[model samples]
Structures are given as C-alpha cells and as structure tokens.
Target chain A: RKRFFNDDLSPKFQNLTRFKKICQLVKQWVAETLGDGGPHEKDVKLFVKYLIKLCDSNRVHLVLHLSNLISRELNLCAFLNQDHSGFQTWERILLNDIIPLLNRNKHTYQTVRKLDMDFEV
Target chain B: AHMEQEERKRFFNDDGSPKFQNLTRFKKICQLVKQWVAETLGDGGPHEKDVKLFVKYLIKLCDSNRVHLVLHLSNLISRELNLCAFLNQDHSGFQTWERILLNDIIPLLNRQTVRKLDMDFEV
Candidate 1:
C-alpha cells in the first residue's frame, strides 16, 4: 500500500516538502480512525486509496475494488442498523439495488484479489 | 415427544414475527429464482427479458392488499438489486429500480388508497 502510494504521489508532492504534509494527513486520519475505533475507518481509507489509484491509473482492478468495498460496507452497515429510522431508506437502496448489480460481475472480484499481493511484494 | 413439540413451539414463537411468517415463503421463492438466474446467466449475460419477468413475478407476489407485506417486498427487492449491482461492476440499474419504487410505485399506491377511502366515505 505504501509503495503504491509513493508511486502515485504527484511530482509536486514527491518533492519531500509537500509529500511530508500529505503523509502527515494520512497518518492523522489513520491514527484517528484506529485509535478511536471509528466505524469502518480502515476499510474506508483502503477504499479512498483504491479510488485514488483508480483515478490516477484507470486500473480496472482498483476501480472495482473501491466500488465493491463501498457497496459491501454500505450493505453491512444497513443490515446492522435495524432501527429503521436513521438512514434506513438510503441503506435500503444501497443494499438492495446497488449491491445486486455489483455482485453480478464476478471478474471484478477476481481481478481485484489478484492485485492484492498473492506473492511476496 | 412432548418435549420436542414444546421446543418446536418455543422456537417458532421466538423466531417468527407475523411479518417474518408472511414473507418467508415469498423469500424462499425469490432466493430459488435468484440462484437459478445467477447460475444460468453467469451475471454478465444481457438477458434483460428474463430479468424483467422475474422482477415482475416478485412485484406481483409483493403487491397484495397487505400494505406491510407490499412495503417489505419493496425493501427486499431493493436489497436484491444492491447485491446484484455490487457483483456486476458497479452498474446503476439497481439504484434506478429503487428510485422507481420509492418515487413511482409508493406514491401511486398511496394515492390509490386516498382515492378509495375518500369514495368509501362519500358512499
């Protein structure tokens, strides 16, 4: 993940000075999420990184990973939130409509997992 | 034998809400159909006609006089679509279906009820 991040950082940020600040933000977000046990922080950051890589490189795997992660998280969150009051409607649409369509594409899951370091990186 | 029957009765009482009992049979059918479709179509097939037929059957099963059951079916359909969308490389069809249900079907059903109740009162 770090290697991927380093590779994708813009030239301006790669210049040590800007890169330091960006790294600081990343570290802060990570710490806050992990330290506070915030809902889905690690997964969300993974998703953000995946999205960034996707936008930068147009890698189909990264795009699919990000979408799959978001869709699954949305469904899990909805299912657990059984109160039917907060975000139930939004959760319903996300879980029912969005997820079903995403689940149909088996290649995306296969491709994304392949990129996840089956061998020593 | 009596103990087994008592345990069974208790299990049913604990697990079975009226809503659950009503929707269980329908859900079983949906699951079977969805499985068959997934197995046969392999998720990427452009079989829109088949998908439409299955969805129509689902809607009919869900669209009875029972308001709660109807709403529950809509919710269930939305959930199924979301699962499909996740598998199918982020298609927007599931979201579109959800929007149609909430914006079109629910409103139409609500209006129909209002008209019916108003006419009944007048009569």
Candidate 2:
C-alpha cells in the first residue's frame, strides 16, 4: 500500500492523530458517496464546503483530495477500458461546471488560486 | 544481480543504440520551443500577455486533440524513464533527471504558457 504519511506523531499531539483519522474517514466518505452516484460534482463541492465550515478550520485538503481521488478513479476506469464515458462526465463537471462557477465568484476563485500559488511558491 | 548490473551498464552506454534509441523528435520540439520563446520574448521580455494568448490557443488545441496530446505525452515520459532506468540502474543520476522533467520542467513550461496568456488579459 502507498504510505500517505511518513511519520507517527500521535503521542506528542493527540489531535494530529484525530485529524489524520478524520482525513481518512472523509476520504472514504467521499469515495463511497461520489462513487455510488449519490452526489454530482456540484453537490460534492457544496458538501466539501459545508464540511470545511463545520470543521471550523481551514482544512480544505479534504476537498482537494476528494477531487483528486475522483479524477483518479475516472482516469483508472478509462485506462482499464477505452470507454471513457464516466471520465468524460467528470471532466465536464470539473472544467465546465466547477471551474466556471468558481471563477465566477471572485472571492472563491481568488482564495483557491492564492492557496495554489502559495503552495507552488 | 551481476548480470543485471552488467546489463544496466551496457544500456547506459548504449544511449544511441538500437534498443535505446534517443527521442530526437521530442528533443527537437523542446529546442524549438526554447528558441521560439527566446526570439519572441527575449530571456526577460514581457510574457504575461503572451501566456494568455498561448493559453487560449492551448485550450483550443485541447478542444481539438487533448486526448491525443495527453496519451502521447504520457507515452513519451514513460519511454524516456524506461530508458533512464535501464541505463542508470545503479546510479540515481538519471532518476533525478527524470524527476526534474516531471516535477519541474513540464510544470515550468505549463506555467510559462499560462502566465503569458494571463498577461494578454492585462494588456
């Protein structure tokens, strides 16, 4: 299995372990929900935003990880067989629905872009 | 293990050999892109606007042939790394070079294109 984290720092900070566990749980929740066809991209976005709000922290990694996981799943499906219907649908949602909506809202887009820029810088 | 090591050494030296042919086409493309950017923008000329137009053109190109481009690039990277792995199995140098291409070089190229197009918006 691919190791997500390198170290174990649980005794030093209990909350770190809690956060890591929560991250894993949230990843599972997203995979099950979206993969099960329960939530579309818009719904997933709203759900993730709500999750961040509820968490009362700036932990948006959950959301981004979910998006990446979703995209990877679609990509894997396409790779297994040349049928890319599911992948195409998700790509449309990503490029057309999600991106345009985020771009339309200046604050949201700016926040996301700033976060990406900061990561790169 | 001895045979494997010898094979790797042979592969490393056989860069232009039949089984390990160099990717002349992609190297040529990289050279051309570098030359074009140098000629048009100079090393430090204004690139923001150029990036924006380039992005517009890229999106159009993606619309037309994104799948083909993605597949070809993936294949090219895979082939290059396979060769690198065969040639430098004992040394980390080629692996480092491959990482640089994947992590730094392609991203830098992509960012330059995007930044140039974004500049066009300002102009």
Candidate 3:
C-alpha cells in the first residue's frame, strides 16, 4: 500500500517526510488518471514543471524521489499489457511531455544527473 | 521484465551499438550540428536568428532516414543549456535558444520518432 505524510519529527526528518508525502500524492494522482486513460497530458507537464522549480529551489531530493516514483507508476500502468486506451496515452505523454523536462532538470542539477533516474518509459 | 529484456536485445547489435541504420552523411551532419550549437550558444549574438537557422538545419537533418538524430540533438542542446543556467554561466542570449527549443524544435518531433527512440508499443 502507498503512504503519504509521515508524522512530525525533527526539522530535517519532517521535511523528508513532507517530500515523501508529496511523492505519494504525485503517484496517486498519476495512477488514478494514467491507469484509467483519462486526460493527464497537461497535468503531467505542469507537475513536472513544478518539480523542476523544486529542483531550482534546492529541493532536488524530492524531485528525484517524485520522478522515480512517477516513472515506475507509469511503467506499471503501461506494462499491465492493457489495451491502447491506457498504453498509448501513457506512452505518448511519457515520451513527449515528461521526458524532455526530466532530462533538462537532471542536466541542471548535477546531483540528479549523477543519480540517473531512468525515464525509459 | 522479459519483454523489456527482449526489446533491449532487439534494438542493440552484438557489438552493443544501436541499430538505427547509421549513415555516414547523417553522422557527419549530426556532428556538425553539435559543434554549431556549442559555438552559437557560447557566443554573445542574437540568439533568435541563430536558433531559427539551427531549426532549419535540424529540419533538413530530419529529412534524412535517421529522424531519431533530431531528438538526440534536441536533448543534447537542451541539456547543455540547462547546465549553463544551473552553473550561472548563461549569457544574455541563452534564454532565447531555450525558448525556441521548447516552442519549435521539440514540437517538430513526432510520435513515430519517439516510439522508435524508446520502446515497442504495439496496440
């Protein structure tokens, strides 16, 4: 099961918990729309843009976590061997809209680039 | 996982190079375009015009059989500019080039090339 928003601890721990919660939210939102073949094209772009801003603001840890989680979620949605409605929509949005931003953000954040989160979906 | 491994094998040759049907002319043009991007971005000139010319060259390259080169180049240029901005090394003309890439060159890439670049998605 997926969990969001860990309880409060130290500031650092609390922040990490907060980011983990954000990742959960992102994954939930994506899985809901993406698995169902709903309209998520614009939302994916907007979310990724927000993540990039997170990177710019020195929240790259969250960016990295959210990106990896989202990719895995998307790949799982596509890998279900589902029909075109789910697969094609996921494929198009992943490659066309999501990847370009991921690559740009990774390149900008040297640490994120070093991590090399797979965007192969 | 099995399908992913099979897809990987199908795309790669025994020598571990992509089977994109390499052409000498296409390879040369790719290299030239790479150098051109580096030089243009490094210079302090009007980036709008330079980027327009860059798009023209990219369009001509896509006319070749290896359309994936355009996506590869677009990623390269995008990453390069991204590094510059992150490192606080961008000149005044940097934003112009980034704008055009987001607006123009990337949009030029179609689903066919994207499908080829990544995986086999047969529905």
TM-scores, in order shown?
A: 0.25, 0.24, 0.33
Give one digit per residue, the lDDT tens place, for model 3 in A1-121: 2222233321232244466566566666666664466444555545655656765666666655655676677667435544347656765766666555545543224344324433321
Q: DockQ of each candidate's interface versus the true one?
A: 0.02, 0.02, 0.02
lDDT of 2 by residue, A8-120 (tens): 32121213446456556444543444334333444545443444443344434544554465556555552333322444555566555433332232312223433554566
> Model 2 over residues B1-123: C-alpha lDDT tens digits?
355432211111222101112333545533433343333321222134433433343344344433334234434543444433333332243334344335533553343343355568974
TM-score of 3: 0.33
Q: Taking the tens digit of each residue's C-alpha lDDT, what string does model 1 give over B1-123?
A: 355432211111222222332345756754654454333333333234444444444445345434454566556555555455445533444444445455644653453443355578863
Q: Which segments of candidate 2 are over 4 A away from where they belong? A: A1-19, A22-26, A29-48, A51-63, A78-85, A96-121, B1-123
Q: Which ten residues in a row have the lowest lDDT in candidate 1 chain B?
A: B7-16
Candidate 1: deviation at residue B67, Å? 3.5
Q: Which candidate wins on TM-score?
A: 3
What DockQ class does candidate 3 belong to?
incorrect
Specify the CAPRI tier of model 1: incorrect
| RMSD (Cα, Å) of model 3 | 21.6
Question: For each model in turn, which proportion of the native inter-chain contacts is also found?
Answer: 0.00, 0.00, 0.00
